[PDB]
Design a protein around this ligand. Sequence first.
Ligand SMILES: [Mg+2]
Ligand SMILES: [Mg+2]
Lengths: 396, 396
Amino acid sequence: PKVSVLITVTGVDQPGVTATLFEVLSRHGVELLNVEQVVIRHRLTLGVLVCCPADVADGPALRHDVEAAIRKVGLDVSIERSDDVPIIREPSTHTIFVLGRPITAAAFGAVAREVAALGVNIDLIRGVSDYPVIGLELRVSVPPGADGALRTALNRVSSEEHVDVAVEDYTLERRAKRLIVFDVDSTLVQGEVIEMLAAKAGAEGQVAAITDAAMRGELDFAQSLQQRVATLAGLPATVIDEVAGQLELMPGARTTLRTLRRLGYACGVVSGGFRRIIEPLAEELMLDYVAANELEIVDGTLTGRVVGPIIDRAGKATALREFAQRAGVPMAQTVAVGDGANDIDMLAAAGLGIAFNAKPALREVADASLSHPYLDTVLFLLGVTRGEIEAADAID
Amino acid sequence: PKVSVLITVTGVDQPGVTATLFEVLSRHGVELLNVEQVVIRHRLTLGVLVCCPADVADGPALRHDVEAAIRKVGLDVSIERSDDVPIIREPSTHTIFVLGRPITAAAFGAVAREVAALGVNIDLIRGVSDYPVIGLELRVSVPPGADGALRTALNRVSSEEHVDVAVEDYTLERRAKRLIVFDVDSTLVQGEVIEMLAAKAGAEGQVAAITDAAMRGELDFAQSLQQRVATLAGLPATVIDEVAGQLELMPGARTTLRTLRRLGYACGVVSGGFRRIIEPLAEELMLDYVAANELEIVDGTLTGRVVGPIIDRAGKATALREFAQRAGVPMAQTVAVGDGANDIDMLAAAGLGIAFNAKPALREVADASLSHPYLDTVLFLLGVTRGEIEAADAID
Ligand SMILES: [Mg+2]
Ligand SMILES: [Mg+2]
């Protein structure tokens, strides 16, 4: 067939429109180049690009056949000779997630304006969750070299409008993520294990102050760890088992892990904490990899020391590279989730660094930040919808 | 905010509509529940579900503000109090790929009708390629227990209309594919190595007849392999190197592998052929796993025997399970591509069994069949578009 024709059907959705159009088209010489159809809120759009011999596109016969069929049932149709028209649209360059509880119109409006301001086209918008937060995705096409300006603008928008806003490369490679590590304390697990241990010794107050100082980046991590663990000197070592039994997962953790397993992820934890507490929990969640420091115990008593070497800021990033090497995963396809300045290097090395209810120091270097206390909002940044999670869990 | 309102904007696409609507909405008390937007062939649909206090949805103020803003620039808008309306649509249950060169309207019409006949809703249609074949995807929602009827119907449609039609589960787990194996002969590579070797001995005719008999399922594979390899008895062993240098990849093979690497796949080959030929080629393509039989050589001469055990029909399936075990991949997340009755068990064991220009015996048990001589059409069945492949290759 010689020449191209574009047929576009719009109106209120009704059963059978799709089959009726192509059945009609088949009476003429029609081969398909492209078909695009969606229904949004009972509004149907059906765009069909065809090629027919220049011995039928000329013709009123095709036009009359289509127009009568479509108009009679109450929809509209346009029919145009194209030839200057793309067959298939290009892929989006980036995707943008907007999360909030609530997402105001003012906030989403602020996002749309910053996007428009940079010459960025919105290729699509859809919802990805209604729970535990509202989530929206926009797939966009960013002009070459505007990506940094875009992230900057949206970070300002996120801070002023009280929504989480994440910009991600939407290219084939950098969205085939296959490996994730979680920081434990205040990320996978609620609270700080070291503070729970210090409480037994009656030093919770001092240890929490040092902890907060360290997690904000104000303190050297290694020195901070030495000072805090020293506070435990003389405790019976069963304090470890106690604290282990007291641990509560971050809300959404079980959903997060369970969903990441479905997707074939390798899952691990990297922690400055203590392996006698972490490894036990890790086994129960059936994780793949654990890096943790180590408490010194003499005669069933904590000495107040940690066994070197110390997992420090650089150490966490090293554990990730290690994990990815043993896993066969390129750094670009890795994810890291953390909350403290302790996690800064690890997030840096990751293909996707996610800051979860994080200190300002971590948010400043993270690829994305989550501000709501639901760990499963991580899944939304990984291209999963609430609907898919619920569906998967229904089939058991 | 108390009550729900649905706002729907339709018409010819123009810059700035998205930001304008939410900017207007922000003047009222508006929080977002869901946003859905697409443009197809310059037709815009923007559906927004909001909640505002029952102290503004009552009001003409919101309605007038929105209607004036939208209508003045030449689009339409409807505004309705909902409350009985879903926030977010459910995920599709399956996806359907239609491939052809050409895809006639009659063919696609036949697909749409069979789908409608089973009570299956078309949730979306899009193009996934314009080259080397036309490809279309339909995401669908299949009533519980109609899946088998659907596959049956579409197989009949595929056979009578000359298009490839594949139905796949669209659930989270069964679309996280991470491992693929290719049969070598007449799948990854053009022609049959055993026939190329037999040509040197002057027995190509007899060996091709046995080969075709075996690949149609008419012959026992092991016996067929013994008979054919015996034909090589007395050849100098450098025939192996000759044939190795003569091998040509299936069109699209390099694109296929290169794209599968981007997506973090583990890639391998399972073959009844000969490792001295295959392993060399496998190294050059940087594959992860090879299973192959073995030619017996005495004093630089082929004896006409293969070294046991023989990779047979069951053996190929076993090599896959093995590969997946060493890879940490569940069978449900594995893919197998083959052409002959020799591959039947391997395709069976795979989560996705793909028959590529295959004998009737293989097509009958395959999850999907490809009929065009382009190996990269495999990528379309794995949820990749032509656009994404071209984009990825542009960034190098
Ligand atoms: Mg932490
Ligand atoms: Mg073969």
